[PDB]
Enzyme design. Structure first.
Site, short mmCIF file in Angstrom:
data_model
loop_
_atom_site.label_atom_id
_atom_site.label_comp_id
_atom_site.label_asym_id
_atom_site.label_seq_id
_atom_site.Cartn_x
_atom_site.Cartn_y
_atom_site.Cartn_z
N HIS A 132 0.80 -1.23 0.00
CA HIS A 132 0.00 0.00 0.00
C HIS A 132 0.85 1.30 0.00
O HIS A 132 0.29 2.39 -0.09
CB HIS A 132 -1.08 0.02 1.09
CG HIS A 132 -0.59 0.20 2.50
ND1 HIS A 132 -0.23 1.45 3.00
CD2 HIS A 132 -0.51 -0.70 3.50
CE1 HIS A 132 0.10 1.25 4.27
NE2 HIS A 132 -0.06 -0.02 4.62
N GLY B 197 2.41 6.12 10.31
CA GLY B 197 3.83 6.02 10.00
C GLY B 197 4.46 4.72 10.49
O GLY B 197 5.61 4.42 10.16
N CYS C 116 3.42 1.66 9.73
CA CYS C 116 3.28 0.60 8.74
C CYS C 116 4.64 0.06 8.28
O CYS C 116 5.59 0.84 8.11
CB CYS C 116 2.44 1.07 7.56
SG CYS C 116 0.71 1.39 7.97
C1 LIG Z 1 -7.06 6.32 11.30
C2 LIG Z 1 -7.46 4.94 10.76
C3 LIG Z 1 -6.47 4.43 9.71
S1 LIG Z 1 -6.35 5.34 8.17
O1 LIG Z 1 -7.67 5.60 7.70
O2 LIG Z 1 -5.45 6.44 8.36
N1 LIG Z 1 -5.65 4.33 7.12
C4 LIG Z 1 -6.50 3.54 6.23
C5 LIG Z 1 -5.80 2.26 5.83
C6 LIG Z 1 -6.54 1.24 5.25
C7 LIG Z 1 -5.95 0.05 4.86
C8 LIG Z 1 -4.59 -0.10 5.03
CL1 LIG Z 1 -3.83 -1.58 4.52
C9 LIG Z 1 -3.81 0.89 5.60
C10 LIG Z 1 -4.42 2.07 6.04
C11 LIG Z 1 -3.61 3.12 6.79
C12 LIG Z 1 -3.56 2.71 8.27
O3 LIG Z 1 -4.39 1.95 8.76
N2 LIG Z 1 -2.54 3.27 8.98
C13 LIG Z 1 -2.22 3.05 10.34
C14 LIG Z 1 -1.63 1.88 10.82
N3 LIG Z 1 -1.42 1.59 12.11
C15 LIG Z 1 -1.80 2.48 13.01
C16 LIG Z 1 -2.40 3.72 12.70
C17 LIG Z 1 -2.81 4.66 13.68
C18 LIG Z 1 -3.34 5.86 13.31
C19 LIG Z 1 -3.51 6.18 11.97
C20 LIG Z 1 -3.15 5.30 10.99
C21 LIG Z 1 -2.59 4.04 11.32
C22 LIG Z 1 -4.26 4.50 6.66
C23 LIG Z 1 -7.63 3.92 11.91
S2 LIG Z 1 -9.41 4.13 11.93
O4 LIG Z 1 -9.82 5.06 12.94
O5 LIG Z 1 -10.14 2.90 11.78
C24 LIG Z 1 -8.95 4.86 10.37
#
Ligand SMILES: CC1(CS(=O)(=O)N2Cc3ccc(Cl)cc3[C@H](C(=O)Nc3cncc4ccccc34)C2)CS(=O)(=O)C1
Ligand SMILES: CC1(CS(=O)(=O)N2Cc3ccc(Cl)cc3[C@H](C(=O)Nc3cncc4ccccc34)C2)CS(=O)(=O)C1
Ligand SMILES: [Cl-]
EC number: 3.4.19.12
Lengths: 298, 305
Positions: free
Chosen positions: B41, B143, B145
């Site tokens: 991703h 960050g 990931c």
């Molecule tokens: C803030 C959320 C993640 S996101 O929308 O920023 N995000 C979508 C997404 C989808 C699929 C895949 Cl493979 C990766 C990703 C990304 C993602 O999960 N990143 C993150 C990984 N680990 C911890 C994270 C803590 C805070 C923020 C981002 C984190 C980016 C968490 S929630 O409240 O359910 C939405």
């Protein structure tokens, strides 16, 4: 999201661990530049009388599969300093620091100069640490990392009858009223680190746990009268000042969070948990909470 | 004496962490020999995440679009391929700090250490377990990931997890190092939720044996149970079924302490029924399930107190 008991990355410390043998005793040493630091009880008491009888070749120092040559030896308080021929090429930027009770650090537990695990813990108000150590762990070290500089703060020396641990700073001065010898010694009655429980309540609010918040506030004096009754450390104005940033971020005044702690102390949790815990957690400092709820790297 | 949640020393993994940038996205990569492994991703935009065609996004990229940074040094990318949900970037320098390693896929209930990183820089290490619902309860921010999960047995690092996403409940989902996700999750921002979580029964039992080894027996009783009667009770408290494999795995701890597995099962049934009554077990007021039978034997003494 998530709140874990997190230790510092141990790599800079792993590259310093050595095995020290003197006669029948084997324990761990810390090799920094051309000196190996280890507990003086490796020679076991009149330590200066036992030390004068030893020669450099009596101390066997092993770094990995390589034998280091001891060319000198001296004692500083309860630590033995063994001068070696080779400077450690993996020596990191470091300082020797003495911590206060309530401060936390990472422990790299070792056996035979080989690191086996890393865990986070705190210097209790009674100067003991609730660690996880077996025989052979002596000489294992406690540390913090500030940017790229490792601050060594603890060296393991002994276990007390209650299963808790006692040790020294890297200058060989004990934390607590302990001595390095087989004698009747016990840990004093312990207390809860109040400023740490408060910081952990702010971390819970940051992660979306607000069930324990109330509309009430308290005076610092009224809070301390209540806290003394539950074996909690007194909260000082310095502690209140240190919690300022977390108070500004969450919009909950320090004395406002103290009224919540007072209600938890007199009423319990009522089948509820805070950050997956049914106990009030006191081994995260205000700085640990700010560091884990931001991305500070090393 | 003492029982702590202990992580493996992280040094062998720290020497493998790199920063991977593709356009506006920056995350972590694992540099082993001449290959950098990272979540696929990294090639996506936030919009793309709804329904991304990774094959179509990847064909449009060239080697020079991927910026890899190891410390203060820029690594040159000379090839790229996709294996399931992981991107493999071939680089022109082999990592001199590459340890002895293996890629292992773990099962739910297994534990591992996590080296959390931001911008190719490690910030902390913690211990955790693969939950029965295939999620991990980690501590990750944006960050993180590409951060990895591992165990170190002897001098060999067994990589078992790579971080990919945070689900709506704050729990985390990721893949093994061959890019196969743990659980029914996809690297898509689609409506997905963790299944109902359950307690890892074989781990709680192992932790009760660790408490007996450290000298605590207040919770034991004079009763035994059948495996079937234990499971009928355990299911009612959202505890995972205990299998004959679990009973066999607990054999060494049973022989050491002198307490039969089904007698320890009876004591657990009683703990679930009565609670702790103001008491603790190994400094905990909850029944702990993130220590395996192997973790207990590794950390605890071979002599019971
Ligand atoms: C803030 C959320 C993640 S996101 O929308 O920023 N995000 C979508 C997404 C989808 C699929 C895949 Cl493979 C990766 C990703 C990304 C993602 O999960 N990143 C993150 C990984 N680990 C911890 C994270 C803590 C805070 C923020 C981002 C984190 C980016 C968490 S929630 O409240 O359910 C939405
Ligand atoms: C069994 C005890 C330790 S000992 O008698 O084996 N011991 C004497 C002694 C005296 C002075 C100094 Cl400075 C060090 C030592 C040593 C010591 O404490 N070592 C140990 C350190 N950490 C964990 C240990 C786990 C088990 C055994 C030894 C451990 C060895 C614990 S107790 O019940 O308080 C007595
Ligand atoms: Cl497994």
């Amino acid at each position: 999201s998530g709140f874990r008991k997190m230790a510092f990355p141990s790599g800079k410390v792993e590259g310093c661990m050595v095995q020290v043998t003197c006669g029948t005793t084997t324990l761990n040493g810390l090799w920094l530049d051309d000196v190996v630091y280890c507990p003086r009880h490796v020679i076991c008491p009149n330590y200066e009388d036992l030390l004068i009888r030893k020669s450099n070749h009596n101390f066997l120092v092993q770094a990995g599969n390589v034998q280091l040559r001891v060319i000198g030896h001296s004692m500083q308080n309860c630590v033995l300093k063994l001068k070696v021929d080779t400077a450690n090429p993996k020596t990191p930027k470091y300082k020797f620091v003495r911590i206060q009770p309530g401060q936390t650090f990472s422990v790299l537990a070792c056996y035979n100069g080989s690191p086996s695990g890393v865990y986070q813990c705190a210097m209790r108000p009674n100067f003991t640490i609730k660690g996880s150590f077996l025989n052979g762990s002596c000489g294992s070290v406690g540390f913090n990392i500030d940017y790229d500089c490792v601050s060594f703060c603890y060296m393991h020396h002994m276990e007390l009858p209650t299963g808790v641990h006692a040790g020294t700073d890297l200058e060989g001065n004990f934390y607590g009223p302990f001595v390095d010898r087989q004698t009747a010694q016990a840990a004093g009655t312990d207390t809860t680190i109040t400023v740490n429980v408060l910081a952990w309540l702010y971390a819970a609010v940051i992660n979306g746990d607000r069930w324990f918040l109330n509309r009430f506030t308290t005076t610092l004096n009224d809070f301390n009268l209540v806290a003394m009754k539950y074996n909690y450390e007194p909260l000082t104005q310095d502690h209140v000042d240190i919690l300022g940033p977390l108070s500004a971020q969450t919009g909950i005044a320090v004395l406002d969070m103290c009224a919540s702690l007072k209600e938890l102390l007199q009423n319990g949790m009522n089948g509820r948990t805070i950050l997956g815990s049914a106990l009030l957690e006191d081994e995260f400092t205000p700085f640990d909470v700010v560091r884990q709820c931001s991305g500070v790297t090393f």
